[PDB]
Design a protein around this motif. Structure first.
Motif, PDB file in Angstrom:
ATOM      1  N   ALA B   1      38.075  31.152  58.258  1.00 56.88           N
ATOM      2  CA  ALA B   1      38.330  32.572  58.045  1.00 56.88           C
ATOM      3  C   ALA B   1      39.240  32.797  56.843  1.00 56.88           C
ATOM      4  O   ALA B   1      39.046  33.750  56.080  1.00 56.88           O
ATOM      5  CB  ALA B   1      38.939  33.192  59.303  1.00 56.88           C
ATOM      6  N   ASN B   2      40.236  31.930  56.658  1.00 54.38           N
ATOM      7  CA  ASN B   2      41.115  32.060  55.502  1.00 54.38           C
ATOM      8  C   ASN B   2      40.447  31.553  54.230  1.00 54.38           C
ATOM      9  O   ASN B   2      40.844  31.945  53.127  1.00 54.38           O
ATOM     10  CB  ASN B   2      42.423  31.310  55.749  1.00 54.38           C
ATOM     11  N   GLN B   3      39.440  30.688  54.359  1.00 57.45           N
ATOM     12  CA  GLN B   3      38.744  30.186  53.179  1.00 57.45           C
ATOM     13  C   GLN B   3      37.743  31.205  52.650  1.00 57.45           C
ATOM     14  O   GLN B   3      37.626  31.394  51.434  1.00 57.45           O
ATOM     15  CB  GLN B   3      38.046  28.866  53.500  1.00 57.45           C
ATOM     16  N   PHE B   4      37.011  31.870  53.545  1.00 59.26           N
ATOM     17  CA  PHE B   4      36.000  32.826  53.108  1.00 59.26           C
ATOM     18  C   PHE B   4      36.641  34.122  52.628  1.00 59.26           C
ATOM     19  O   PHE B   4      36.258  34.670  51.587  1.00 59.26           O
ATOM     20  CB  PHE B   4      35.011  33.101  54.241  1.00 59.26           C
ATOM     21  N   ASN B   5      37.620  34.632  53.381  1.00 59.49           N
ATOM     22  CA  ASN B   5      38.245  35.901  53.019  1.00 59.49           C
ATOM     23  C   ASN B   5      39.001  35.790  51.701  1.00 59.49           C
ATOM     24  O   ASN B   5      39.066  36.756  50.932  1.00 59.49           O
ATOM     25  CB  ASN B   5      39.178  36.363  54.139  1.00 59.49           C
ATOM     26  N   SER B   6      39.581  34.620  51.422  1.00 60.05           N
ATOM     27  CA  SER B   6      40.267  34.430  50.151  1.00 60.05           C
ATOM     28  C   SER B   6      39.274  34.225  49.015  1.00 60.05           C
ATOM     29  O   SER B   6      39.549  34.597  47.868  1.00 60.05           O
ATOM     30  CB  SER B   6      41.229  33.247  50.244  1.00 60.05           C
ATOM     31  N   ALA B   7      38.113  33.637  49.314  1.00 56.07           N
ATOM     32  CA  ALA B   7      37.106  33.426  48.280  1.00 56.07           C
ATOM     33  C   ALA B   7      36.500  34.745  47.822  1.00 56.07           C
ATOM     34  O   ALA B   7      36.238  34.936  46.628  1.00 56.07           O
ATOM     35  CB  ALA B   7      36.018  32.482  48.790  1.00 56.07           C
ATOM     36  N   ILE B   8      36.266  35.669  48.756  1.00 55.26           N
ATOM     37  CA  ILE B   8      35.757  36.986  48.385  1.00 55.26           C
ATOM     38  C   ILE B   8      36.794  37.741  47.565  1.00 55.26           C
ATOM     39  O   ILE B   8      36.454  38.486  46.637  1.00 55.26           O
ATOM     40  CB  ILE B   8      35.342  37.774  49.643  1.00 55.26           C
ATOM     41  N   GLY B   9      38.076  37.555  47.887  1.00 54.51           N
ATOM     42  CA  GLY B   9      39.124  38.186  47.101  1.00 54.51           C
ATOM     43  C   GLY B   9      39.191  37.648  45.684  1.00 54.51           C
ATOM     44  O   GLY B   9      39.524  38.379  44.749  1.00 54.51           O
ATOM     45  N   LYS B  10      38.875  36.363  45.507  1.00 54.00           N
ATOM     46  CA  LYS B  10      38.846  35.792  44.165  1.00 54.00           C
ATOM     47  C   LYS B  10      37.683  36.342  43.351  1.00 54.00           C
ATOM     48  O   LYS B  10      37.797  36.487  42.129  1.00 54.00           O
ATOM     49  CB  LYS B  10      38.766  34.267  44.243  1.00 54.00           C
ATOM     50  N   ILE B  11      36.562  36.651  44.005  1.00 52.43           N
ATOM     51  CA  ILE B  11      35.431  37.248  43.301  1.00 52.43           C
ATOM     52  C   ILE B  11      35.781  38.652  42.827  1.00 52.43           C
ATOM     53  O   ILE B  11      35.462  39.044  41.699  1.00 52.43           O
ATOM     54  CB  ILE B  11      34.180  37.248  44.196  1.00 52.43           C
ATOM     55  N   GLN B  12      36.448  39.430  43.684  1.00 54.01           N
ATOM     56  CA  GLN B  12      36.862  40.774  43.294  1.00 54.01           C
ATOM     57  C   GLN B  12      37.879  40.727  42.161  1.00 54.01           C
ATOM     58  O   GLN B  12      37.889  41.602  41.286  1.00 54.01           O
ATOM     59  CB  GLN B  12      37.433  41.517  44.501  1.00 54.01           C
ATOM     60  N   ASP B  13      38.742  39.709  42.156  1.00 57.66           N
ATOM     61  CA  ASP B  13      39.710  39.568  41.073  1.00 57.66           C
ATOM     62  C   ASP B  13      39.045  39.052  39.802  1.00 57.66           C
ATOM     63  O   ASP B  13      39.435  39.433  38.693  1.00 57.66           O
ATOM     64  CB  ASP B  13      40.844  38.637  41.501  1.00 57.66           C
TER      65      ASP B  13
END
Lengths: 48, 48
Positions: B1-13
């Motif tokens: 959960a922390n790996q996927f949610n942070s990965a989507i945040g990196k795409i938005q950034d």
């Protein structure tokens, strides 16, 4: 209205509408990025 | 959960900070812009 317009420099057919653009006193007409004339100033009175 | 949610945040950034990642689609617009503008500019050429 759709009319054939010639002011002193060119021939063309289109719809003439007065806008808020401002031309310099020595600037007669103007063109767009396509090198086609999108505006003309009245050679008689002052209108754009 | 922390790996996927942070990965989507990196795409938005990445998409917000780097605007050149979409250049693949920007080329399609550029190829159309260069094609449409050239076809219009050929009207001014004398062609002999």
């Amino acid at each position: 209205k759709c009319v054939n317009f010639n002011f002193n420099g060119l021939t063309g057919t289109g719809v003439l509408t007065e806008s808020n653009k401002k031309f310099l006193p020595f600037q007669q007409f103007g063109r767009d990025i396509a090198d086609t004339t999108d505006a003309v100033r009245d050679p008689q009175t002052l209108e754009i | 959960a922390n790996q996927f949610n942070s990965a989507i945040g990196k795409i938005q950034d990445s998409l917000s900070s780097t605007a050149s990642a979409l250049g693949k689609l920007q080329d399609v617009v550029n190829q159309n812009a260069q094609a449409l503008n050239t076809l219009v500019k050929q009207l001014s050429s004398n062609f002999g």
